[PDB]
Design a protein around this ligand. Structure first.
Ligand code: SF4
Lengths: 109, 67, 344, 33, 232, 109, 109, 109, 155, 33, 33, 56, 49
């Protein structure tokens, strides 16, 4: 299955952290390069809240890909569909709902 | 941020490992972009002599008591 | 284009070897390295050994030097008779120690770096090299006291008395009054003339007495221009009590003047020189006329396209060059190169 | 653990390990160091 | 046991003792330099520590690796010193990297220091309470814009020596010119190239037979002028 | 584009920690030297709060530079234009606004 | 410039931590020595609050010395003027005031 | 002077952690020995509150001893005079009072 | 000094430079195989990196230990590659573990790459800007289900 | 990290490094260990 | 300290210590490595 | 040979627990170390020969 | 240290049973060193005799 349909409530964290090659010379001078060839990928600290019955469906979706594999997702940040992978998806059960916390990492693949 | 590049005063007693304080490097344990523990080859290359770094110091046969 | 009998070269080489008997030790080494039958020709092979480096080495070995008996003599010569089977590294090291060269994989060919008086290739100041956390852009080390030999026993083979091992004792009695008396033994690989053995021992002693210090000054991305054996200059503003290098902040071609960091002091007598970098990496050097404050430097001529934040160096008449020859260059998986060098 | 103090300890433990390995190689099979 | 005074042994066993001050002396007089005196600290009056009437100038200096072991390699201590303001650098370019000099280390309990060091004086001041050790500089291992590290060695250090040392040669004298074995005391005759000279500052022996004949010293020639033909 | 022209929130940190050469063995005599020529280049922990529409523009500006490629900036601290570089610039996307947490380290070259 | 004129409001940390040579023998016995020769130097965790227009002057004063160099200061602890060095001086900007947190280390020099 | 004659605040910690010889490989049979003769020398985390004027006297007392030179003290815990040593004694200098935080580790010699 | 073109020297001294791409080639033609071209990265269009008209395919590859030292032991670099999907395994069982092959390494500034690599093209594209080094495979030091490490040596 | 296990791991890593260096020095130039 | 990065540093320090110990043993008493 | 695959497994769970008393780390597989002299050395002890003497 | 060598020579001069019926000095010279060895080798030989 390809697309992620659930929605993220609280306000996520979108961390970029570009990789650069940096050399620090002597009296205050330096030398910087973009290191890589294709931008930075960015990662989203996503949290879902779902009813106790749909949590099984969400778990099945996140377990089918199983750490590897990528799914399509349109983040509510730039509204540009991207390919992402999830590898942790911790989940806390409650009386009537389940709260998922996960880290979606964008991948070129 | 920095490159430590350990020399000789650092290895001979931790008197100047704390001279640079190795603070931000140790807090960042290094990086994938850059490597620490460079271990400058100054005194190691010169142990046999300066003339050993320019010529390979041709060898001689073992001394035999037969002669 | 080489005549072994007269040991003369006509003009440019172009390659295209020729089968003539010669005593040139560079080409004896070439035969040892690239012979398919008994040498290392099956492995290795030609186009892996720098033939031009060996050409220059053989030219150096063919130069005439005082014989010591009254006449002249070729500098370095063969006449070895190798009978026992030794490892190829042993024979290569004896060949490369008889004529003072070190073999290193350049990256495309196996080159040989010969200890010769060479001109500076590049200059590095403290604003052109990597700064570690400790304020030591350049680290200097020295050879030990017992590693400065002043007496050598060279074992050559005399062809006059009888083809037997004659020992020639070389000494430097001035250094024996300073660093005790450090004596060694050495085997001159191709020597059959007293002059060549004495020259080899004297070269060892002179190198140990004159060349003393080494430097580690890991640099930025420019290090991919360096091969081992390159001679460079180090303008360490901490080794000297003055500042003689930095970066150019602004260039004013009309009413020619330059802005630099730090402050520059003119000498009492003589014309100071400033080495800037052209608009195409050519490092021309020009003459300074006067300095206002300590920053605004007016030069004789502003080179074309001298960009801002470009490296400038200062040459004074009463300052030694402090040349160093590279012996090792290491890539740091970072973009920086770790360079080791020794006095020149 | 502060790096400056730990580096000396690591270096000295490396020295001890090297000496022990050298003495081990001087045994029968070994490598005679 | 070391020959140290009873006062130091009395102080060593005390539960609460005074600070142990280590004073250093660099002696380059045998290599053509001067004598420098250093201490890692000043005194309570902001002045260099005065020991036995001699001032030891404050300078960051620290020694390590001092031990007495007979088995195995000879002990090689290390001495790290500050190279700020290019001071040691100035010695490296004037004294051939300080190599061959002497380093003298004194351990003194601060209670025995001279009375001038303390504001209230020292009633137990005793200039004869010290422990002295001598070493030699073998190599300036590192010298940078921050510091300088020196390798020290025991003065004996039979590392590069051989025994017996005198070598049997022909056509070459192994004696030292105008030395005891050479036994020459005449006027200037020639230089090392046998060219005649009346200049005493340019008078050296070629160590060949002709050089010896120039001085009529063939009787004291250090070579053996027949062995070149029996070795065939 | 070469001038960060957005406005930063009141509470921002400015850390200096200049670079000096220190020599001190144990707790004895100490010697201090100014080390390089451009001693302290500071660091500003900048925080921004922007509507969800301009978050895309701010992130595009920060991502195009991508760690290297310093840009001009006038901090509200000394009001002097300087050249700075950013490397992390995390973000958090609330219901109506988004907050940026970036670090500006000023450079010379 | 030699003297520090600004004032510290809240109550600072005055840490002594003298250096001693301590040996621990067996059944509870020990051996202690003062290690050094001239006391302990003692350090102050100082914090200033200044109007936004005077923060530039304070930073200029703290940057002129630049980690090395010493200035005179009379701590509101013992009222004896001492020579101190500052090496961090973190600063936090606000709407109308700037708050500096610094560490002053007493030096014999 | 040889006796600490000041008063400590109510909240004071007393840690013991005696010294024993433990031999136990994995989770098998274990053996314990009393190790030394003077098993536990405890540690008192002493806190004091003193007017700003007497802080000078308190620090003079704690500084003259200077880590070594144990002094006599009667803790309010077992009311038995002992010999203790202090090594940190940090302080906070409020508007009208100062708070001392020191560690008294008891000794034998 | 190495014989490298003036454009690379000009780029090396710039304060803000482009990314230094490293392109690898494995030549087993002398040992009865083919030539495989690799690059650790794709390009901005999600395609194998085109250099001098030749496509270098994306594959996790990383070399280390490269140095030029004459004194002492001859330098032995190392090359780590991805053995996911059992590709290198297939090469090990067909070419006697790749022993005896050649490894060619090119350092190229990304500014000089072919214009096809970038959406907006490359005005400074120059196919003659590269630094080439040849080594030989000496031993496949490790081959696992994840990665594979090869020892390199001077020819 | 806890000191005991870290020190043991450092000791084994040092032994491995010493063995690797010894086997490296037995090559051509080296030191022949 | 993350283990993956620290293990390489420990290995390199061990290599340096092994080289230093080997060069030390080539002195007079030593073991001649 | 480079910390390229020490972070391949990321060592996170083991490093956070430094190890255990039940289990040991740093196993250091002896694959390439035992094969340095050759495969024939892992099966036979490579009989030695006397040093070549110039007297002969 | 000349005094240490003095005591050592005193110890080496002590008379001990010869093994044939008479007495004999404890430790003695009569070496003839012809080859050139390192000074450490000769010193260790002397200090092991
Ligand atoms: S050759 Fe004669 S004059 Fe010259 S040093 Fe020897 S003994 Fe003296």
């Amino acid at each position: 299955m390809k697309t992620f349909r659930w929605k993220v409530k609280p306000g996520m964290d979108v961390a970029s952290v570009p990789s650069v090659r940096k050399v620090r010379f002597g009296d205050g001078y330096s030398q910087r390069a973009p290191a890589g060839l294709n931008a930075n990928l960015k990662t989203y600290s996503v949290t879902l809240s779902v009813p106790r019955e749909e949590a099984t469906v969400l778990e099945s979706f996140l377990e089918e890909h199983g750490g590897w594999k990528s799914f399509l997702w349109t983040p509510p940040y730039e509204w540009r569909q991207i390919k992402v992978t999830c590898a942790k998806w911790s989940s806390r059960v409650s009386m009537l709902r389940v709260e998922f916390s996960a880290e979606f990492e964008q991948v070129v693949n | 941020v920095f490159q430590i590049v350990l020399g000789a005063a650092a290895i001979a007693g931790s008197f100047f490992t704390a001279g640079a304080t190795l603070a931000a490097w140790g807090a960042a344990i290094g990086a994938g972009g850059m490597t620490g523990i460079l271990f400058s080859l100054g005194a190691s290359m010169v142990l046999g002599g300066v003339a050993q770094m320019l010529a390979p110091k041709a060898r001689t046969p073992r001394i035999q008591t037969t002669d | 284009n080489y005549n072994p009998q007269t040991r003369q070269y006509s003009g440019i080489w172009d390659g295209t070897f020729k089968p003539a008997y010669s005593n040139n030790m560079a080409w004896c080494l070439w035969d040892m390295l690239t012979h398919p039958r008994y040498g290392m020709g099956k492995r290795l092979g030609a186009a892996d050994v720098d033939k031009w480096a060996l050409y220059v080495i053989g030219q150096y070995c063919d130069q005439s030097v005082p014989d010591g008996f009254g006449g002249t003599e070729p500098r370095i010569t063969c006449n070895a008779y190798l009978t026992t089977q030794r490892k190829a590294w042993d024979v290569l090291s004896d060949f490369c120690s008889a004529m003072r060269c070190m073999p290193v994989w350049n990256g495309q060919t196996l080159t040989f770096v010969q200890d010769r008086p060479s001109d500076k290739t590049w200059t590095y100041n403290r604003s052109n090299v990597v700064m570690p956390d400790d304020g030591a852009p350049f680290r200097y080390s020295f050879s030990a006291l017992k590693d400065r030999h002043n007496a050598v026993e060279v074992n050559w083979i005399d062809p006059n008395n009888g083809w037997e091992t004659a020992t020639e004792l070389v000494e430097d009695t001035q250094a024996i009054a300073r660093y005790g008396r450090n004596v060694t033994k050495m085997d001159a690989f191709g020597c059959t003339s007293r002059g060549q053995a004495h020259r080899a021992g004297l070269w060892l002693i002179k190198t140990e007495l004159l060349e003393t210090q080494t430097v580690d000054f890991s640099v930025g991305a420019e290090g991919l221009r360096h091969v081992p054996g390159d001679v460079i200059e180090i303008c360490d503003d901490d080794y000297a009590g003055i500042s003689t290098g930095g970066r150019v902040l602004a260039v004013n071609s009309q009413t020619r003047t330059l802005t630099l960091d730090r402050e520059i002091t003119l000498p009492s007598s003589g014309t100071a020189l400033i080495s800037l970098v052209d608009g195409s990496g050519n490092p021309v050097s020009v003459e300074v006329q006067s300095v206002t404050d300590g920053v605004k430097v007016k030069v004789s001529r502003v080179p074309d396209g001298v960009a801002e934040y470009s490296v400038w160096e200062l040459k004074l008449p009463t300052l030694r060059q402090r040349l160093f020859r590279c012996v090792s260059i290491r890539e740091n998986d970072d973009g920086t190169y770790a360079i080791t060098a020794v006095q020149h | 653990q502060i790096g400056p103090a730990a580096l000396k300890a690591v270096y000295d433990m490396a020295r001890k390990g090297a000496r022990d390995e050298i003495q081990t190689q001087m045994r029968d099979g070994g490598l005679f160091s | 046991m070391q020959d140290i005074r009873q006062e130091t042994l009395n102080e060593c066993t005390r539960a609460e003792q005074s600070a142990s001050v280590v004073l250093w002396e660099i002696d380059l007089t045998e290599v053509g330099g001067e004598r420098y005196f250093f201490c890692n600290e000043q005194n309570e009056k902001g002045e260099p520590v005065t020991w036995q009437g001699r001032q030891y100038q404050p300078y960051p200096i620290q020694g390590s690796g001092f031990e007495l072991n007979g088995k195995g390699t000879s002990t090689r201590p290390t001495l790290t010193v500050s190279n700020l303001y290019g001071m040691v650098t100035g010695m490296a370019e004037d004294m051939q990297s300080l190599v061959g000099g002497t380093v003298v280390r004194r351990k003194v309990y601060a209670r025995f220091l001279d009375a001038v060091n303390f504001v209230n004086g020292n009633s137990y001041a005793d200039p004869e309470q010290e422990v002295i050790s001598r070493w030699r500089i073998e190599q300036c291992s590192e010298l940078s814009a921050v510091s300088a590290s020196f390798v020290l060695s025991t003065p004996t250090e039979t590392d590069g020596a051989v025994f017996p040392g005198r070598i049997m040669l022909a056509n070459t004298c192994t004696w030292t010119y105008r030395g005891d074995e050479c036994g020459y005391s005449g006027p200037a005759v020639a230089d090392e190239y046998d060219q005649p000279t009346s200049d005493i500052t340019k008078d050296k022996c070629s160590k060949c037979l002709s050089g010896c004949k120039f001085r009529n010293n063939v009787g004291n020639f250090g070579g053996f002028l027949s062995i070149n033909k029996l070795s065939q």
